[PDB]
Every structure is written in C-alpha cells, then in structure tokens.
Amino acid sequence: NNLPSIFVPLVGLVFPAIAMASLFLHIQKNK
Amino acid sequence: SHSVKIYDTCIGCTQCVRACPTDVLEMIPWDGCKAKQIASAPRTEDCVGCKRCESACPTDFLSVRVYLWHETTRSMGLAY
Amino acid sequence: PIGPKRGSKVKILRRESYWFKNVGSVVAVDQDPKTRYPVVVRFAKVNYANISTNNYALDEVEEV
Amino acid sequence: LSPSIVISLSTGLSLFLGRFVFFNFQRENVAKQGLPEQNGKTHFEAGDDRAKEYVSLLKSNDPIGFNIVDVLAWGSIGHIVAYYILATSSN
Amino acid sequence: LRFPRFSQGLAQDPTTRRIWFGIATAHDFESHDDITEERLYQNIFASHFGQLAIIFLWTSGNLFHVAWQGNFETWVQDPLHVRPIAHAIWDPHFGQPAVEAFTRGGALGPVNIAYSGVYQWWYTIGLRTNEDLYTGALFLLFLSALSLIGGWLHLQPKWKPRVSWFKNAESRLNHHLSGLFGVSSLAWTGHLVHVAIPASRGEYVRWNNFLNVLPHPQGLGPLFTGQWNLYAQNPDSSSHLFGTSQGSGTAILTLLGGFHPQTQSLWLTDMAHHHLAIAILFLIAGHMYRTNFGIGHSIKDLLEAHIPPGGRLGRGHKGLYDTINNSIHFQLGLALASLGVITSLVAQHMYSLPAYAFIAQDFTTQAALYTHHQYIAGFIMTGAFAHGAIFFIRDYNPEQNEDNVLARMLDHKEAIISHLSWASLFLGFHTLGLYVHNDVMLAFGTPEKQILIEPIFAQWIQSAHGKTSYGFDVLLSSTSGPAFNAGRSIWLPGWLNAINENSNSLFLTIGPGDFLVHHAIALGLHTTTLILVKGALDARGSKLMPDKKDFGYSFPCDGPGRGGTCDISAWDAFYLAVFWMLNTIGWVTFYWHWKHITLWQGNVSQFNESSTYLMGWLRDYLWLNSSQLINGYNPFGMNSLSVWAWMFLFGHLVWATGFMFLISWRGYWQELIETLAWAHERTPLANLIRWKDKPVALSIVQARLVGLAHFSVGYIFTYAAFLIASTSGKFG
Amino acid sequence: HWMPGEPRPAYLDGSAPGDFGFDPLGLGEVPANLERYKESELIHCRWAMLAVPGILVPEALGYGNWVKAQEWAALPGGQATYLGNPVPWGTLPTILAIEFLAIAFVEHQRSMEKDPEKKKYPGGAFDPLGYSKDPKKLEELKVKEIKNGRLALLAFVGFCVQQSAYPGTGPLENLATHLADPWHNNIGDIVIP
Amino acid sequence: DISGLTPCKDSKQFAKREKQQIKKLESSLKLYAPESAPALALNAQIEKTKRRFDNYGKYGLLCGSDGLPHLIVNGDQRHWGEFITPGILFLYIAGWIGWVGRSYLIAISGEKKPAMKEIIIDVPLASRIIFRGFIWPVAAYREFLNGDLIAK
C-alpha cells in the first residue's frame, strides 16, 4: 500500500513538532 | 524559603549563630538554662540550607533543625 | 537538693538520645527551679559527634 | 444407577437440619459477628446509601423466624451435596 | 500560577527545576495542593479507567497490524516451516542491501519477524482467517471507547462515588471473587467447548451458526441427570492431526494428563475441565462475607478474635482492619507482592508445560517470554517493598496499632536485619570460595580435584514425581505404592510418559552446576530482601537520624555533620536494591538460556562439564555464542542481524552513560554551568537572546534516578539483543 | 507426685481427681484452657475404654483382627458382616450417612451445654442406678475412672504401634508370638535390626 | 549406586583422564636430557599424578559420566569422610577461635582504657587465655546453662 509513505512522516516529523511547540508555549505561560 | 526551628533543649553556647554563612540566626535572653540565652531565627528568607549550624550544636540531638522547603533565588545561591 | 545525688548511676529514657537505655553517671544537678534540663550525665562511649556529656530532665533519668 | 429426582431429597434433609438442629448456633454466631463497620460506624451509617439492610426480607411469618435467605443457602448446600453424590457414582 | 497547576511551591521556582519536578510529581495525588480524601479516590478511579483504555488500544493495534501486514493464513497451513510477521518496515534511511536483507517470510518488502507468540496463541483458540482478526480489533476498539466513556462519566458531580462506597470491603470482595474470577472462568470454558475444540477437529463455528451446532452429541441431557461421565467418552486419538478431523474424538472434558503427541502441548479438553473446576471453586468462595442480606462473615471480627491466649503475639491482629482499610499504600504493596509471585509462577510454568500449539518447537519465542516475565516480576517485587516503606512513613499510626503483630515487628528489627546479614554472608562466602577453587583447579590442569556436590534433595524430589534416571524408586517412581495405585487409572500414564521423555523441558536432569547456580540465586534473593527490608523498617528513624519521619520518604541527606549522611533515606534503600534485583535476574536468565541452548543443540555434556568454573561460563556462553551477533555488519556487507548488533552497541552506550550520573555528583556541575552563563552574556550577537528559566545542575536525588534509568535501559536492551540474535541465528 | 523430688506447678494443687502434677510443658497455665482440657481428657478416656473391649473380643472369637474388618469397604460393592452374617444395609453410602447424622446430633447437643460441671459429669438421666448418691464414694469412683482411662489410652497406643511393626497382625497374635519364645520375640529386634 | 553414579575404580573415563594427563606430561620430558634436573622434576610430577589417581581409586569415591568425582552430603555413612568429619573439625576449630576472642574481650572490659588493649595486645594475658579454648564446648554449654552466655 501507499499509506505508510504518509503516516510514518506524519507521526515522526509533524506531530512531534506540533506537540513540542504547544507544550513549550504551555510551560512558558504566565499570568 | 527553608524552615529553621529552635527547641528548648538549647544551652546558649552561641556556636550555631557564629557558624551561619548568611545572617539568619541571633541570640536572645531567656530563662531555663544556666547561660540565660536561646537562639532565634528571624531571617529564614536568607537561609541557603548548608546545615553549618547543625554541625556546631553540642546537644545530643540538635536544638536547631533545618527543613528544606520551597526554593527561591536567594536559597539557591544564584549570582547570575 | 533536687534529683539524684552526684556520683550515682542512672539510665536514660529519652528515645531520641544516642544513649537510650544506657547507664551513665551523674556529674551535677542544677538547683534552679526554672531550669528545664538540670541533670548532667556523662558516659563512657562517645556519640556520632564525639560528645560524651548531655543534659536531661528529671523525668528522663531513673536511678539504677 | 440412582435416579436424579430422588437423590435431590438431600435438600429436604439439609433444610430440616438447618431449621431444627443448627438454628440457635447459627443465629447466635450471626449476632456475635455483627454488621461490618468502618472506623466504628457501619457501612450504611458511615455514608454508603447502598449498604442498607433489606428489612422487608427479614420479616417472615414463620414461628421461629426462618427466612428466605436461609432457605436459599440450605437448598444450595443440599443441591451441591446431591450433585456430588450423583457425579461420584456412574464413574 | 503556572505549570504545575497543583503545586504553589514548584510554580514559583525561577530555575529549570520547575519543569523537571513538575513532570515527576504529576501522579502523586496525596501531595498536591488542597487535596482531600474523596478527590484522591475519584482521581484513582479515573486513572484506572484510562489504564484499561490504553491496554485495550494496545491489543487492538497488535491484532490490526498482524491482520493487515502479516502472513497468518500462510502460517496456519504449515506452522513448522513459516516465520511469523509482526509488521512492515518503512524507513527512508534504508539502503538497497537493507531492503533486500529484511525481505523474509513470504512478504513483498521489508518486515519484522514476531517473537511474542501471538500466532500460536491465536491459532490455538480457534482463529483461522484474517477476517477474524479484523473483527477482534474492531471489538477491542469499541471496548477502549467504552472504557474512556465510563472514565469520563464518574468525574461528574451527579455520578461521583463517596468515600464510604470505596471502603465497603466485604461487598467488593464478594463481587470480585464470585464474578470477576468465577464467572470469567466459566465463560472461557464456554468459548473453549463451543468454538476452540471444534476448530481443532476441523469444525467451523461462528456467530452465524453457533446456535445450531451441538458441542456434544447428547446435548445438555447428561449434565442435568448427573451422568457426567458421558462427556469424557471417546477422546482424541494419539494419531490426531491438529486442525483436521483425522483421528479426532467427541469428548469435551477429560483428565488425560501429558502432552498432545503432535503439537507437544496440553490437551484442549484438559484446560476446559480445569477452568470449569476453578470456576465452581471461585463461585462458591464468593459467598463468604456479610452484605445487606443478613448472613456472612465480618472481616473485622475475624481479625480481632485471632489472638493466641498464650500472649506470645501480644494483642494479635486487633486493629488491623482499620490499618489496611485506611491506607492505600498497604493495599498496593499487598497487591504488588501477590502479582509478582504469580508472575514468577507464570514464567516458571509456561516453559515446562506449554499450552499453545507449536510453541515448544519455536525456540526464540520461549526464551523471550521467560526473560520478559521474569524481569517484570523482579520489578514488581521491588515495588512491593517500596510501597511498604511508603506506608510505614505516611500512614502508620503507633497509637491505634499498640502491641499488635505490626507493632512488634518494629520492636525487633535488629534481629531480623542481623540474621539476614548472616545468611547473605554465609552464602556469598562459600559460593564464591567453591567457584574460585574450581577455577584454580582447572587452571593447574587437574580437573579431578574439583569440589562437585550432587543436588541430592532435588533429584529425590524429581524421582518422587515419577522420574527414573536416578534410581531412587520412591512414591510415584514405585510401582507398588498406594500413591501410584491411586491415580494409575486417571492421569499417571500420560504424565509418566511426558516426564520420562528427554526432548522436552519437563523436569530437566540436573547436576553440580545446577547446585552452584541455585545457591547463587539464593544468595541474590537473600541480599535483595535484606536491602529492601532494612530500608522499610528503618524508614521512621534510627540512631543516626531519630526523626527521619519528619523529612518524608525522599530527601538527599542530613548534611556532612555527625560523620556524614549520604543515602540515609528509604528511597535511597530502594535505589540500591534495583542493582541487586538486576544482578539476580541476570543470573537466573543466564542459567536458563545456557541450559536450553545446550539442550537444543543436543550437546548437554558441554553445560555439564563447563558450568563448574567461571572461565567456563565466560568462554563457552558469552564469547562462543556472540560470534554471529557481532557479524551483523562488517566491511564485507550486512545481513538481517544488523539491527540486533546495532541495539547491542546502543545498550552498551546507554549503560555506560549512566555511570556519569552515578560517579560524579552535583557541585562539580553547578560551578561549570556558572561559567557558561557569563560566556553567553558576554558573547556578541548572542546576548540579544536570553533564557527565561535560570539554568542549574540536576538535583541530588534527580541524578540518582537518571543514572539508574540509564543503567536499567542499557542492561535490558543489551541482553535482549544478545538473546534474540543468538537464538534466531542458530534456530531461526 | 509423678516424679518425687520435683516441684509442682502452682495451678495443680492436688485437689482435682487424678491430679499428680504432670505438666512439664505448662500447657494448663491459662485457667480457661485448663478447664477445657479436663473435658477433652475425660471424653478421650471414655471413648478409649469402649474400643479396648471392642478390639480384643472379636479377635478372641476368630472373627478377624480389627484392621481386617475395614478391608471390604475399599473394594467396589463390599458388604458389611456381623458375627459372620452379612447385614442388608451394610453398603458404604448407607453406613456413612447414618453415622454422620446420628453422631452430629448428640455431639452438638453436648456442645450447647454451658455449665462447666455438667460437661464432665452430667449426672441426671445418664446415671440410672444412682451411683452418685454418696459424695464420699463419688470421689473414689472419679479417681478410679481417671486411673483406668489413661491405662486404656496407653493400651490403644500400643495397639496402634504394634500394628506398624507387624503388619496384618492382631494384638492377641502378637501376645501369642511373644509367649512362645520370650527371649528372642520381643521389642529388641525392631529397635536394633 | 546413589543417583546413578559409578565407583571410580570401575570408571573408564577416569582411566582415560589419567592416561591423557600422563601422556601430556611425558611429551614434555622428551625435550630434555634424562640426567637434567627438569627431567627429574617431570618424573616426580608423573609419579605424583599416578599416586593421586590411585588414592582417589582407593577411597571409594563416585564418578559421573565425565569421569570426575562427586561428593555425597546427604548423611550416608558410606560417605561420612566427604562432608561430616571435616565439618565437625571445622566447627570445633571455629568455636575455639570465637571462644578465645570472647574470653579476651571480656577479660579487658574492666580496665580504665579498654581500647588501648585492643590496638596493643597484652601478650601474656592472651597467651594464658589461648590454651583455655581447647575445652570450649564444655565451658560454652555450662555458661549457657548458668545463663551467663547472653547479656541481660
């Protein structure tokens, strides 16, 4: 199939970047 | 800031207040020992947690006790 | 006079003491009423701080 | 080959033993071992609403207070014994 | 406020310690701000729901991948000559030789060979096509969704349980014992009888026809009339071929004993009878405790009345009900101890009494399963004692527990600790002395001077089970004994056939090397127990620190005074016992693996002769069996063992990296970090960027955990790579 | 005294019937425990003083020793015999059922008693001939009963042990074997093979 | 035949081990003149090897399938010299040493500075105490009966 050519980069490069950016913004937040 | 407590087994030797590397501890008059003195701890916001005071106490078990607690810029010894 | 006489042997009943349930000799007893721990006891063995003398109240020493 | 319908008469014997012989012993032991409790309070009186005893099932017009739970328990014992007897035979 | 939300003290830390300690204290609900008992219980309930959801998702993922990318239908036809496939590989970093090398099985591309034994397990329970696995995966996805939904529901104000509901012990015990064990095991017998037994005889029974197929020709008639012997008549013949109707029978409940001749595993009709019997036993036992129906036992009165009148146990068990009921660490410790014991039992029993078809012939799977379960059991056993110490610190009340069994244990801790020390010293001294004597005797070329001691007691026990290789002739090995005559017509023939056949792992033959390694295992167990028990009992104070209970479970030291006080907490006692647990499990797994490798190669004499001296171990186990593994890639090419060699080196590197955090301590590093701040603040074009958290060295307790995690990960990965590579290179 | 020159336990004053101060292990220290032990001792003695006549008399009439009478029940379909005459109801599950029901009733009836004296010497209807009319004679009778019961218990222990050394033999057979050649047919050979 | 073992004197593998060892020793002797000292040493080694194998054959040891002696420690009277007698001798010697140490420690406990008698031993007192441990079992048992063995 062609699905692994999409989901492997999606889980290895895109989702980690989004999660790390969101988590850094969360931990750096103050009020 | 850390917590520094004094118990009434103190003999008034002054050795703990001479040992502190920041001014945290001082002597006050008292009655209950021959020396008529007891240690007091008014400035515990300046305590670094070194336990030099507890190494100096001659009582069987310490009449001064330090309990480590929430850490701040002063209590971490940071000069950055 | 207050408490044990000088030279007598007493045993310690303070749980946080290094010499708990050990026998020591009385050195002196302070006769002031406002003193909280007037009994001076000395021991043969040193503690972890290399000390061999301590003060106790009248309720933490018994004559043996 | 003993018949299964007759062998189940053990239920009657077990019920007879429970109702006429071992009644006082069981009742006094149950009275001695009271309701389970937590921190000195029973489960219901400590706050648990679903630990309340069903008083409606305790009331039976039997002259000695024989319950339906007793019937169920002694019948279960009788059935277990009868089926053990039935299975042991014909081996 | 800011991250962490649950700690005002941590949220005001101006350094990087705020993040690290915010991560590490998330699941310690007891120490959070404004915490109550009810909130604690409700949070625990929700966390349990989440854990169940995760487990169901994991199993569903395994099944879906096996169905989508595996070779289950090809493996079923010829189980002994096909390699199972775990999943496919899609790595853009691969080269062409790597693409060619990993294309094994019957696949069209790179794949992984499964060593978890799921193929044999699923084939044994009746799954035959890829459509079944898809349905199972869908059902488990639904179950995970249901678990999450149930987890969310009980956190709402309308559906929150109360603390009194959580403390109703008798009702929970009754319900668990009767339904979660008895009914659960009763239903598995139903699945076996209705689906799995017909499948092994060539019969296809599914949802569309299971209401029309009779599992037995006579139906339910024999059950209600008591003629239960009709269900055992006409069992499978010894000429049975698994999965086909050739030589099959009609029985559904037997007590044959032994192994199936072809699959070399337990009979399917024995397991159904076993589960039925245990289901009845669990169903009966779940009627003991008192509920709102007016009959049963009360646990508190059971505990309070078990006091010997002689007074040798003081007040006995009085007050223990509230001690256990009001402490969650006590319950967790009891559960962990029981779980670890049963995990070790599972590991010991699955290798010698296989239950899945064609798993005894798969050599790589058995070793992996054994090692996996033994390591997990060791970790659980450490956790039990850790939580026992945490209970003694946080929850124990001396006044409510006066002079009972629990309080009298703290009274004589010195005797227990000293006797454990004596046992450990004796075992270690003599075992090491004998090993070194044997090594010196071999070095001087005189092997006939060795001290070789026969394990007489274990050989006698084996003979008492029916083994005839030692000539002791006792009990089951005696043909005229009452014990032999009692069961000679029920289970003894098959069991005796299985036990006296030397190609399996049922009661292997033993010698002096087994004796020495068993005593090494005993030494390891005793030393680990000594460390953990000393940590648990001294948790509330000692002569060196009388008031240890005021400082908590985990704290660095009490400073350099009174001679110095590094590693004085109970947490530090747990930290030191992980090294001994790892050592003991390593010894156990080395013994198992070498024995089974020599057995499978058919040269058991090598183990018999070379296991009495340590040079024999080092030369004939580690050096000899690592040749293929270290040749996964060389200046001449690579093969399918390249990943295992890479993981071997990776584990070596991670293990050695842990020594940095263990040998070098904080004050070297805080001084080093202080110069980097100046360097950054004085560097042009870079001082335009500044940090928000002031950078600091790791804490004293942090570095112990970080060093210990690196040590464990390296240990596990290195041994796993070596074991899998060595077994699969030789036997596939 | 059970051993002259030895001190007595404080709780054994010498007033109880058959009291000779024998308690090396101190099992009767607890007053509640010692009260139970007397009842159990009397029950054991009374049960063993009926077994001894029931073991020797059937063997003296040629009906077989006391272990041969139990062999038939291990076989399938074995039927009980009495005085050489098979009994119609001597099937195994008929005997087991009637024994449990009959005994469970009387022993539970004894259990429910709460007067400590009536648990040992209940009196009343179980003494039809009225031998307990005289308190002076009664003490002598109690001493006689206790002294005989312990002897019967020792005899039963001898019965049991002699069977192990000579399997398949009765006590009267062992006595006959000993009487013929006393100086070589005795305990000595068993201890020293 | 305990545990399926065989006597050393009937074992063929034992003889093969002896022959291999002797043959290995003899191949080195051909490198030296017969009169030289190394030849004498090798001759002595060969004789000692033969004597050791003969002695192992005489004592009634048991061999396995590898031709190596095995020890029985279950308490059988036919093999009491393997474990029981050396064990009793070791227990006697260890009790002697421990009793002498305890006696010396008790002897100097009443002095003004008992610590100084531990780093600088009092030789005459120890020498007088050394002989007393020869009867340690009797003294220890009588002390246990009198209740002076355990500190109060």
Ligand code: CLA
């Ligand atoms: C019939 C009634 C019933 C049932 C079925 C359950 C069931 C459950 N309750 Mg529960 N509960 C009940 C009544 C019931 N409850 C009542 C009346 C109360 C109130 C008094 C509670 C109060 C309660 C609380 C407070 C909690 C639960 C929890 C749980 C769950 C624990 C998960 C578990 O045990 O793993 C399953 C484990 C087993 C089946 C057995 C494990 C050990 C065996 C020996 C292993 C067998 C291995 C075997 C060989 C197969 C393995 C091999 C295989 C891989 C091939 C479970 C689903 C917990 C939870 O949150 O879960 C969501 C929890 O915290 N319950």
Ligand code: CLA
């Ligand atoms: C290979 C390394 C190694 C070795 C040999 C040991 C050995 C030991 N550990 Mg240990 N340990 C280790 C690593 C090791 N540990 C590690 C990595 C950790 C984690 C930090 C621990 C944590 C640990 C704990 C927590 C405890 C031990 C304890 C023990 C002792 C109990 C075992 C026994 O019976 O004694 C075996 C006997 C010996 C080793 C004696 C050999 C004596 C020879 C004859 C010395 C010869 C002297 C010399 C040659 C003559 C003079 C010449 C001159 C040049 C010196 C034992 C000495 C326990 C203990 O001490 O309490 C009883 C204990 O509580 N260990």
Ligand code: CLA
């Ligand atoms: C504390 C010491 C200790 C410990 C933990 C163990 C533990 C174990 N032994 Mg073991 N053993 C010991 C001492 C010990 N042994 C000694 C001293 C001997 C020589 C007599 C043996 C001889 C021995 C044999 C022959 C076998 C085992 C086996 C085993 C394992 C199975 C359990 C068993 O059979 O127990 C055995 C338990 C004992 C023998 C009790 C010994 C405990 C006492 C206190 C030792 C004191 C020594 C004593 C004073 C010597 C006096 C002799 C003197 C009269 C000459 C188990 C791991 C079996 C096994 O599976 O091996 C693979 C086996 O076949 N042991």
Ligand SMILES: CC1=C(/C=C/C(C)=C/C=C/C(C)=C/C=C/C=C(C)/C=C/C=C(C)/C=C/C2=C(C)CCCC2(C)C)C(C)(C)CCC1
């Ligand atoms: C009215 C009345 C009467 C009578 C009554 C009656 C007669 C009753 C009855 C009742 C009954 C009659 C009851 C019953 C019950 C039963 C039960 C409760 C059962 C159970 C069961 C079970 C539990 C089972 C089990 C099992 C097993 C174990 C195995 C196999 C399977 C089975 C499932 C079978 C009279 C006239 C006298 C008087 C007046 C009143």
Ligand SMILES: CC1=C(/C=C/C(C)=C/C=C/C(C)=C/C=C/C=C(C)/C=C/C=C(C)/C=C/C2=C(C)CCCC2(C)C)C(C)(C)CCC1
């Ligand atoms: C510290 C602490 C804790 C913890 C603890 C622990 C962790 C423990 C463990 C323990 C353990 C871990 C134990 C174990 C045991 C075991 C056993 C006890 C076993 C037994 C066995 C048997 C009895 C057997 C039998 C038999 C039979 C039946 C048949 C065949 C033969 C034989 C012999 C095998 C707690 C929380 C609680 C509390 C607090 C403190």
Ligand SMILES: CC1=C(C/C=C(\C)CCC[C@H](C)CCC[C@H](C)CCCC(C)C)C(=O)c2ccccc2C1=O
């Ligand atoms: C090396 C070392 C340092 C210095 C090491 C530091 C400061 C490392 C800090 C982390 C760096 C940035 C690397 C992080 C690598 C991780 C893989 C990234 C985060 C992973 C997440 C899952 C958290 C100490 O602070 C120390 C303190 C006390 C005893 C021993 C030591 C010690 O050995």
Ligand code: SF4
């Ligand atoms: S605290 Fe200690 S050192 Fe300071 S005065 Fe009191 S007794 Fe002396």
Ligand code: SF4
């Ligand atoms: S702990 Fe150190 S800094 Fe704090 S008061 Fe004592 S001596 Fe001063």
